[PDB]
Amino acid sequence: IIYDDLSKQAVAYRQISLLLRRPPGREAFPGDVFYLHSRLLERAARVNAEYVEAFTKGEVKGKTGSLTALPIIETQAGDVSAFVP
Amino acid sequence: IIYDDLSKQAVAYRQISLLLRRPPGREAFPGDVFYLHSRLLERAARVNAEYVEAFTKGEVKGKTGSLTALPIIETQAGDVSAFVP
Amino acid sequence: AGAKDIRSKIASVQNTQKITKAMEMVAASKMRKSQDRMAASRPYAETMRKVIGHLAHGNLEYKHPYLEDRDVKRVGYLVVSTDRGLAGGLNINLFKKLLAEMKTWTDKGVQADLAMIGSKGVSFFNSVGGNVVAQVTGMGDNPSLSELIGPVKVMLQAYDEGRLDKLYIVSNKFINTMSQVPTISQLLPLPASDDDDLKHKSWDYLYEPDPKALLDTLLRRYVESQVYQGVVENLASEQAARMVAMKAATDNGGSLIKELQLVYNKARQASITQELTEIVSGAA
Amino acid sequence: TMAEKFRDEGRDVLLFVDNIYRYTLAGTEVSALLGRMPSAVGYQPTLAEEMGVLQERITSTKTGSITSVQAVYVPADDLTDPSPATTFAHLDATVVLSRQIASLGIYPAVDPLDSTSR
């Protein structure tokens, strides 16, 4: 899976969060802008065969599934030291 | 007398003010923080012998009391243009 | 940090860039003038070398100590150095070439003697414990032959006295405005340098008073003039090296401004955001 | 919307906006008048959508097309400021005019070394 801009997601979430009047943190971004991306990217995982069996009710045996993620981030003036990057 | 880190008394007072919902000033410090340190430090003094004799009701004569203060402050990145420094 | 520090630093670096660009211009003009003075020396040395061709090498020849290839027991160097810094590596490359060769010589057990032109070499070899016997300093951008008479006199006086067996000049050679090279070249004993007077068999001078007395002063003046030529080529090479070095430094400053302005803009934005969030969330 | 009407006829229209930056500033002033929390560098929170809803209507289509030429002003000469950073995401080409190329007596004074097109 390729996420074509997490920067633009974070900007949309900043808009939604400011419209709900929530106090912003650094770079006007909300407090949970880390939890936003965390609970997303933590899903790209590889799972062991026991988890696959347990999930799919024994319909599958020995195979290990995986989801691979390549999030894209856009940074201003090559600044790898900004907040969201 | 050596007040170690008045820059942490100020922080505790900021917390107390914000929990009492008092209007925050610059860097969220409450406005009276100058009065907060001003009254504390002004007590460091040398008092002439007559005030001593008046206070000790004649028991001590011809001696001048004295209180010396050395507060300590901590500045981030050498920056001396902050509110408490 | 904070905008008002970084803008002050940007200002100071731009001022520095003004300074170095002015120095590049100045050095670029002085190189042209110093190379004109360089080209105003060739006639004297060239005609005197033709005369020495005829008188000394000749079809008959005159025993002179400076011509003969005697045994080497210790060696003199005349060292040319700048009087001014900011020249790039010019002096240190030159001193390292000299030190490498003087090591190679002392590995045969020969001693060495140094005569210093210019103060930079004076300081360097006082530090590295070289054997400086004489020096002249502060000629600046106005070298003159009369000032050089001292040290070259010392080295000649020591050569004829047998205290020296070979004499070198060590100096930069100007080649191109973009390329100069340090060189060590012998000047006593006098090199064999063609100038075959065979063609000039047709005639011979009336020597007055006599050929040996004339030949002695001709060689003395010729050695002095080759030392002067070396000093002027070194001066022109200094001006070329300062010009290219100040060019490099101006471009370095010009890049540092690009870095500082990105830092500055980041601070500008962060201060605006933290001011405006402090005000708005301080209502209600 | 007038250019969209010409596009329906199947023409190849050209739309000039004489300062997109002032469109952004008018959005900031209105957002402050409504009273919404400031964002980024004091811009409105909706900045990246107020710009997108304009810049996304000017496209080609099966029937016709609208091209657009937009004069841009960059605050404090800062190409990282949210307003330019939001605008450039939509630009395809970029022509820079130069005082020097003009003073040399050349017109149009386009700087061929700064001009670019994706």
Structural notes for this entry:
Chain A has 85 residues and is an all-alpha fold. Chain A has helices spanning 6-19, 33-41, 49-55. Chain C has two domains: 1-59 and 206-284, Helix Hairpins, CATH 1.10.287; 60-205, ATP synthase, F1 complex, gamma subunit (Pyruvate Kinase, Chain: A, domain 1). Chain C is built from six helices and five strands. In chain C, strand 2 (111-117), helix 4 (119-127) and strand 3 (132-136) form a beta-alpha-beta unit. Chain C is elongated. By secondary structure, chain D is of the alpha+beta class. Chain D has a two-stranded parallel sheet. Chain D is flat. Chains in contact: A-C, A-D, B-C, C-D. The B-C interface holds B 23-28, 77, 79, 81 and C 1-2, 278, 282.
Question: Short summary of the structure?
Answer:
It is classed as membrane protein. Chain C is of the alpha/beta class and 284 residues long.
How are the SSEs placed, and which strands pair?
This is part of a larger assembly, with 2 copies of chain A (85 residues), 1 copy of chain C (284 residues) and 1 copy of chain D (118 residues).
Chain A: H1 6-19, H2 33-41, H3 49-55
Chain C: H1 3-39, H2 42-57, E1 74-80, H3 90-106, E2 111-117, H4 119-127, E3 132-136, H5 145-160, E4 166-176, E5 179-188, H6 211-280
Parallel strand pairs in C: 1-2, 1-4, 2-3
Antiparallel strand pairs in C: 4-5
Chain D: H1 2-8, E1 12-17, H2 20-34, H3 47-55, E2 65-70, H4 82-88, E3 93-94, H5 99-103, E4 116-117
Parallel strand pairs in D: 1-2
Antiparallel strand pairs in D: 3-4
End-to-end span of chain C in angstroms? 32 Å
The amount of helix of chain C comes to 55-70%
The CATH architecture of the largest domain in chain C can be given as: 3-Layer(aba) Sandwich
Domains of chain C, number? 2
Subcellular location (chain D): Cell membrane; Membrane
Family (chain D): Belongs to the ATPase alpha/beta chains family. T3SS ATPase subfamily.
Function (chain D): Produces ATP from ADP in the presence of a proton gradient across the membrane. The catalytic sites are hosted primarily by the beta subunits.
Protein name (chain D): ATP synthase subunit beta
